[PDB]
Symmetry: D2
Amino acid sequence: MNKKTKLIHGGHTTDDYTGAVTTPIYQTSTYLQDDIGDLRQGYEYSRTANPTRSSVESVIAALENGKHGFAFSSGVAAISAVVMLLDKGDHIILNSDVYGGTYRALTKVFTRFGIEVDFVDTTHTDSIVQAIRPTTKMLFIETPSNPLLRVTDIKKSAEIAKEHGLISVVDNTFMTPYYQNPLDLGIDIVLHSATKYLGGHSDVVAGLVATSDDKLAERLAFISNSTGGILGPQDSYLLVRGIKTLGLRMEQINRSVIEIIKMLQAHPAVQQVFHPSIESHLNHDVHMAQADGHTGVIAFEVKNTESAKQLIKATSYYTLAESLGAVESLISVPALMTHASIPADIRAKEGITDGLVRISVGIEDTEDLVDDLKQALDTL
Amino acid sequence: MNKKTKLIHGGHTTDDYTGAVTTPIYQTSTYLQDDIGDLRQGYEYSRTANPTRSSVESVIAALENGKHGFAFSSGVAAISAVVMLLDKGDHIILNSDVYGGTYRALTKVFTRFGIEVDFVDTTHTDSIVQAIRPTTKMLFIETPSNPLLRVTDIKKSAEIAKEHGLISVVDNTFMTPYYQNPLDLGIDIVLHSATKYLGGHSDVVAGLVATSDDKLAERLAFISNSTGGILGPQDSYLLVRGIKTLGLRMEQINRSVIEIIKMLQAHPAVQQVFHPSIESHLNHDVHMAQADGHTGVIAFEVKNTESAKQLIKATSYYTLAESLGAVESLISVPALMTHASIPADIRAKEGITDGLVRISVGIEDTEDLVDDLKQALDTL
Amino acid sequence: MNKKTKLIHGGHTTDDYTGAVTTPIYQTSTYLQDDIGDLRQGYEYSRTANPTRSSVESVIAALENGKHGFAFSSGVAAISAVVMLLDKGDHIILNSDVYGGTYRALTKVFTRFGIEVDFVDTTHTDSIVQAIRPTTKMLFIETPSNPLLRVTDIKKSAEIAKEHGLISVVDNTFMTPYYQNPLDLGIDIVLHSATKYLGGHSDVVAGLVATSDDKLAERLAFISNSTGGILGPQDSYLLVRGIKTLGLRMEQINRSVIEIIKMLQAHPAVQQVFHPSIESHLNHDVHMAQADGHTGVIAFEVKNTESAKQLIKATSYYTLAESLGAVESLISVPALMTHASIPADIRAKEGITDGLVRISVGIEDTEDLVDDLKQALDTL
Amino acid sequence: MNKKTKLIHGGHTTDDYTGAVTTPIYQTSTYLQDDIGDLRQGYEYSRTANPTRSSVESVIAALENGKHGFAFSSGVAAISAVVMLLDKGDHIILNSDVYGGTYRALTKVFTRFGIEVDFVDTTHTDSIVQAIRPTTKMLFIETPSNPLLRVTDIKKSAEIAKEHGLISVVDNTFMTPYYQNPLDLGIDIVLHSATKYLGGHSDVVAGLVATSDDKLAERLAFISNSTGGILGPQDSYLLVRGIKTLGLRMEQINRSVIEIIKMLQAHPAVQQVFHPSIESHLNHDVHMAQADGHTGVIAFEVKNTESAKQLIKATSYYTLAESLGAVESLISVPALMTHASIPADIRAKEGITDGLVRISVGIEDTEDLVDDLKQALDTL
């Protein structure tokens, strides 16, 4: 199947029993047994397995070309289950600018269980190699990252991990399985905040994990059954439903990204623009070799906090909110929202100025989105 | 408010905006901000807070006479969040017969993070005192326990915990807040598998935690936001809805329990009957001092595995399934289902014979339930 | 099965395929066919049939001791489908005080299709006989009625209908199948606003119809498939779920009704009290012969509009709202809400004074409900 | 707004109260009133109005450039409400090949209420004029029609209706508001089976109606409130959600239609192909003047029943089922499914041969869909 066909027919999303062309919502906690231990269709207790959740798990496995899928109550729960593959005394390497929620969990929760963490500039793979310790067991990378869209070489990271005996993990949220497939590049585990593009409609919080490794899958299943951060059946259904349109949504988003970037690069009120499609973006070549499309997150700098605040008030179609990947276009200012707890001098050295604006391109008309942002910039 | 009124009007379960008499289902992931950092009603991102989940959290806090409530994707997720209050090097004491899911998580997951566990016969409080170590930080008890309904003195456990500097935790699933309120007896944290009685309809998997301690609540909120085992909005709504009838359901269940036990005690095919209402049950007096009603779980022994298997096939109204607390009556054989991985000789020393049958009394007609089980026993 | 057992095990509310102990929610519109015309489980298109809707239809048929059940998008849709059994030129007799929504549909919609209607005092069965015309085809009665709880003799009405060649219909909303079963008394069709007691939680709008007559059922099915006022699958699920607790809810409501009426009859600020349990209520004897319990709707008179308005502001547990049958107690003033379009002089001749208050007793604690209403009355 | 922007931001689909970027699901039946008759936000009883249903009503009004929208429990319920604008003695003109469900309701239900119907070949507007009677009050047309995609001139029909004093109605299901807007061409009422393209995911049954005429809207609202075929809140939410991707879905469908038709026209096993894009299709010019895109329904003839049956078994990506407009491609044989009750000789004179196959193009990859159908045809 080509990609758009796989989004409709990959995995198991119909009812074998009635023929229903959509996955029934099994709002149930337990299953009758005909004889003790005799499970009619392999279900016994919804925390261990639920048919609607099993459907979305089969879909993400299919879309990432993995064997096993797992659905969690949030992206953070997916990350937590993966980190729980490790033991006290183990060390993990992550990219320097990792999601604030990943950063928080690792430095404030899992350090109390003896997991040690280092945040490394993974855009230079030599810095990965230099950071590996005897106790390192995992390499965890996002690419592209937030909010500056830094790109990390997935295939090289997978090779480094294999050579040094590490479990490799990619957070593939920003690219989605439609454009980037880490498992095909040798990564062990791929994961997503399905809250973003996969659900696509700003109406489900969910995490998804996929792997082809049977032993890691058994370990993940045991962690899931033992710590219980499972996705419910209604959210599993809405996620399956949202994924159906993923290809069309990302293709529209990508058309708009191209034109929006052109407008931003020409606008006199905009300084730097950050997106992996830009020729001068660091590791642009790496991104084009490992992905066949782009994320809809773009960041760009205006002069100062006052210009960013006024830019947002002047748009018609950009919704001021957290999150990304929705059908509606979204806008934020990282220094005031996500990164406000970081001292301003450190933020700036990290490349996040007070005037940095982040947008998540939605599926509105491309000309409307370009013209709306351009006229708002014109007021600065 | 008396208890039945509190189930309807405790907490916040209406919509201030429209006046809707039920909690709207906020199937949403993010919230528009008018100005940066200006939250219209305090919501910014559904993982951190969602109005439907906030509703069920307010209800469980009210019903347990606590200040703060937390809703998780499963009972196991609630337990995991509570255990994560501890650090590597800390020790926890739990009752000897704790739920297999609690047992699994603690011995196979959290031991890998340096949490050490001892399982103690908490029906004698001197055994609790004798087990406390310098590194003990938590005392976790279920009462009554599964499947033999062992009773632990909550008030004495709370006093021991306070004197020895331990966080006390009670799993109150089997009694519900309608009959037993550990926080009022000095316990620090109370938790539930809301999958069971609270939801009540076999159609939600969920965990709930309540506490009056502001600092423990801040620690729990941070763990929840960082590990993300949150309950979704549809499941939160169904849980709120199910809780409305909790008092009526438990009162019907309790009427049937009395008559069923009378019939079991007189039946020649039944040996021991286990339930805290029975006069000869160990710590019967303790149970009646700390609870004003009973659980609907009853266990009783028939001769052997063959008699239990045939008892189940002979009933009309008892559904062979895992779980408990449903409107439908349920039946199981622990030695073949929940405890089958435990060597048979150890099972028996633990008091679980091959002929032990567990029932969860539902809300069917009392005479029907008594007569159905009695005639099935008559076939043995 | 006794009544409480029938509410749990009557009809088909489990999944044969997985063993799920609750009805799956088939949020689907169409069904795969293996061969043309070969329906895997008899489903082809959800408007014609949907498994979740089929579940609630089987339940209402079971509870009313009928053969065929039908689920509609509202009580009004159920009534409309039943009236559509008739042709232009046909006449229908209804009780004099029929629900305003029934009254509206018949006099303003169906009269335009040539259906003629007369509203008769059916509390005297001779007035029914005197109203029958050559073209009369249907006798439609509510008992008890709203808001004065007038009682009509069901068995005599069924006999009159049979002798005169009429289809008999009872709106059984206020009594529910738990206490009154018109089909067992010879009535042809029974119907409900399932929005009220059956759903029970103020969170579903729905209608239900049951009959034992195969030919009327075929006519109803054809009307349903042709005019399409079908109940959706999520609402069908919530209705099935709510019905599980109907017996317990009505028994608690009935205990409170007895005590509330005692308090109202003794209170010096209350004049007449209207409820079929009252010895002096017209056709009290008829009600006790055809029902084995009571409705939770009670009406009572205070002095004037000012006393009713102030009574409502003074209660703690009575919610000012339309509808009835909820777990929360509700209060209204018919002259200001439901009947405000009727000239005040006609309202009074109909027995509805400006001071008439209607309450719907919920499942709060009986003492709380009695004391709350009594102290509010004390302020008058 | 351009069309793709209107699908995201037209109507009201956010929560003013919390800022939630999606419409909350108001699973509720009634609303608290602060003072008698004082509605906090204009809601009193969900049958009369529900905020989630009000959201989808605002969306369809926006997308059709109307003032008022109405949401019904099915397309058939929408049609029934519109027909109920008429009285006994009135006559309606409809296209000769109108949907079997419309045909059934009109000829078997509404004729019993004195509504008279004539089915006219509306592809020649002179046949419309010749059919108008003194009692004609309504002209109802589908364009394109099923299964032969016959095209009727909307603007001319609107002019004829205006001149002759008729209410004009277009069933716009097959084109959707994305490509054809009857209200802008002078039609009085537009309606949809939202079960098809608008929901788009084969998981909601729903009807929608829009109009700009205030008096017709008041009449429709009264009919809706009186006959109660209302869409529930969960289905209203899923419909709003599905509509977000309508533009992207229809654009992908249209790209595939072009290539599929090219392949069908060249295939030696295919005789006639029916679709309005084809140059030789009757009223092709009319269609291109009144629509700016195409439907995804295509019909084409193979030799006989045996070739159609074997064509279907030989495809990989075409699901044998009723309905259309889904993300998955669908296939059917009208003579065996929808039209099997029509004598075969009449079917053929109506242009429906035993070998006529209907497909509904979904959003799978265009090359996959073309190649799959072409190789299946190659087996004939």
